[PDB]
């Protein structure tokens, strides 16, 4: 005995994976290659551990 009218609007939005790209993957690979540089340090030095 009581019916109401609905008009739905589905707004569909997609994110732009650019601002979150650099801010995420770049520092990770940076510290990664810095660690790779860190392997070149001889175990005898001792500064490798602190590295």
């Amino acid at each position: 005995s009581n019916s109401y009218a609905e008009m739905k609007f589905y707004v569909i939005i997609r994110r732009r994976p650019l601002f979150y790209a650099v801010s995420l993957l770049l520092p990770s690979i940076f510290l990664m290659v810095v660690d790779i540089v860190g392997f070149c340090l001889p175990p005898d030095s001792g500064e490798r551990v602190s590295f």
Binding site: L41, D44, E47
Partner: peptide, 30 residues
């Protein structure tokens, strides 16, 4: 720092001894 260290191994190769301690030394001195 990998180059200069006491690891009780090896000897300086003459081929790269002349290239660095002789030639590059004169090149750097000037």
């Amino acid at each position: 720092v990998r180059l200069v260290h006491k690891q009780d191994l090896q000897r300086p190769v003459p081929d790269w001894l002349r290239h660095l301690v002789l030639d590059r030394i004169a090149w750097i001195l000037c």
